[PDB]
Design a protein around this ligand. Structure first.
Ligand code: HEM
Ligand code: HEM
Lengths: 362, 363
């Protein structure tokens, strides 16, 4: 139930232990006034400091003037901070505004088209994002709702995604969670304690060519539908062959324990783990941080199910792109479809109480 | 605690402690064969015994024949029972099948149309329901996904709703939860400890007219959207006047504490608490067991959020119907809309290891 510190060289919500619940929102900007947008970023930062400490925004949820709307909507009153993190990102489309064109980072690359893509344009893209993660869904909804309210008239919500349970791990010392296909997901990631690996693969550096992004990261989001009718009639052996790990323990094929190192040549040549592994991709390594979703039924008598895939990396061109390209022949492709996509530059951390989100850019 | 007993004179999930999370699904039946449906109820009951104890269904999620599909889909491996309850109910439309038309209870009444209703037919009705409540959402979802799989070919999923209340790891058991309008919700309700009130207002009795339903109850489900962005622009006074309680403490107007008994005459005539109170409705009293929802954002950028309202009662005609009728002029109507609806007869409990869901109806 404790608080995660909001200030630092980096934003929280990346290397932080993965929280139980997600509420992700993408926003489009509706003001042409640079000074007004800067004022919004400062007001959002002030609200974020309150929210992540478990306090109400502005002057509170009640006990003000009877004839005014309360500053805070009130539904988180009496709740603990619940490890709430709030992480902001800027999309490529932002840089066509406020005279920012020459500040767009090279590492913020547009993704190519990938075979099998079926992307809904309405639930793709966005000028900016806020990732809210917490152990309590009410706390996460409250944060997004209050940020959107403060932003009324300057930003609108383009699309949002809720995740009911995590399918990722930055804490190898704890139980690895399972996705809706029934497999552990998160065994070989990057842990929050692995400072050298974070510096090499996740955090942007001054020498990479964009000074304002030093200490930031780049985010890829993919909404992926799962064909669970098709999967649930597959044999156990089929399922295990798809991944290269057994279902019960999640060990590499032939080995006894989850965390034993994979021996790739024992897996099928189209196994997911074999294709995705850094040794198959010139060393390319990702920080995965996704969540499961279900949005009702599909109208054809079945539950809807999917995974909202989130990856952080130092450069989209050397992280997600080469790995996803290598997944063109993945056995898993028979059971999934990518139906939404977005990329964001995640700026550096808020250094102290006088700093603000985006201050290095603006 | 960690598990809730499955067997009893009553089904669990009604009077048992309220769990943190909900997965509610409505199913339609596709078979005409009574024998095949009975066989399904028996297999579903066997699965539910396993699920509510934290075990996998059938022969398990792994370690069987490699060339067969696993009996359990495996996404709950490693999780705890999480106080899972599974509660089954039968809709009015079931009784048009299997020769059951003369066994439909009179208390399972069709709802009238109410002012302001805007019901989505696709998210309404259903032949059957399963209410899955648990502290971990993945335990609830795993239960619904596996029941649906076992039934494939005999039932389909018509509609499904996820919901949330409190998070018990961080929030005290005695604290009333707040709804998404920011008000405490549940202060004046029937509690699971109130045996006599449950017998008066919730459980069906033999003398009520339908012997097979003795020890069962009747459920009304309403999916109620909130107009969040409109509500959030209302003044504090306007919000408090809508309910007849204050927002911070949740006390009735002119009182000091949440649990002080209301004085109805101090509230505005169309305040929600005044219209809903038993004294305004000839003594009519409900067990509310609903959950908040947030599904996403709609095409206009607004939050798709609200209350998935669940009420249990001894007779729909003397519980939900009179009370909802009395809300025709509710000040709250400006900020909500009922967009889905269904009613179910929830049979008596599974008595022991040889009993099965629906045995009093089917024989
Ligand atoms: C619904 C989609 C997906 C499912 C169900 C899935 C499932 C899994 C599972 C079960 C593992 C093995 C346990 C682990 O080490 O985490 C794994 C590993 C991995 N996945 Fe995926 N995955 C999906 C999509 C993706 C995508 C889109 C990418 C990247 C483009 C990706 C990259 C990886 C990586 C890098 C590993 C670690 C390989 C290693 O170093 O051993 N996955 N995935
Ligand atoms: C979005 C919809 C609704 C909201 C936000 C809401 C909110 C509330 C609140 C805040 C209270 C006062 C605290 C408490 O005693 O629980 C209350 C009481 C109550 N509500 Fe509602 N309610 C809603 C819909 C309904 C419906 C549809 C019914 C019945 C048909 C209902 C019946 C009652 C009853 C019986 C009480 C208790 C009155 C008493 O005995 O003091 N509510 N509701």
């Amino acid at each position: 139930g404790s608080a995660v510190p909001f200030h630092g060289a980096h934003q929280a919500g990346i290397a932080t232990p993965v929280q139980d619940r997600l509420h992700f929102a993408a926003f489009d900007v509706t003001t042409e006034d640079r000074a007004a947008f800067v004022a919004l970023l400062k007001e959002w930062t002030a609200a974020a400091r309150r929210l992540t400490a478990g306090h109400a925004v502005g002057e509170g949820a009640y006990g003000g003037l009877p004839e005014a709307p309360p500053d805070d909507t009130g539904e988180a009153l009496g709740l603990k901070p619940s490890r709430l993190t709030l992480t902001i990102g800027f999309g490529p489309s932002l840089f066509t505004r406020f005279g920012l064109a020459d500040l767009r980072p090279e590492a913020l690359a547009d993704l190519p088209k990938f075979p099998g893509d079926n992307l809904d344009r309405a639930r793709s893209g966005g000028d900016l994002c806020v990732q809210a993660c917490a152990d309590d869904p009410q706390v996460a909804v409250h944060a997004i709702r209050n940020l959107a309210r403060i932003g009324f008239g300057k930003v609108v919500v383009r699309w949002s995604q809720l995740g009911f349970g995590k399918t990722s791990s930055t804490t190898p010392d704890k139980q690895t969670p399972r996705n809706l296909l029934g497999f552990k997901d998160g065994t070989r990631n990057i842990a929050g304690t692995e400072k050298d690996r974070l510096d090499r693969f996740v955090w942007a550096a001054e020498k990479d060519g964009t000074p304002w992004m030093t200490g930031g990261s780049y985010l890829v989001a993919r909404r992926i539908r799962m064909h669970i009718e098709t999967w649930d009639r597959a044999s156990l052996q089929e399922q295990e062959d798809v991944f290269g790990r057994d279902k019960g323990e999640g060990a590499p094929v032939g080995k006894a324990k989850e965390r034993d190192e994979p021996f790739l040549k024992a897996m099928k040549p189209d196994a997911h783990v074999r294709l995705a592994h850094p040794d198959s991709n010139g060393g390319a390594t990702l920080l995965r941080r996704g969540y499961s979703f279900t949005d009702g039924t599909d109208g054809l008598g079945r539950l809807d199910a999917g995974l909202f895939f989130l990856a952080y990396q130092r450069d989209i061109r050397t992280g997600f792109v080469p790995v996803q390209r290598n997944l063109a022949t993945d056995a898993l492709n028979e059971y999934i479809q990518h139906v939404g996509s977005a990329v964001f530059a995640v700026p550096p951390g808020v250094r102290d109480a006088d700093d603000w989100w985006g201050s290095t850019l603006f």
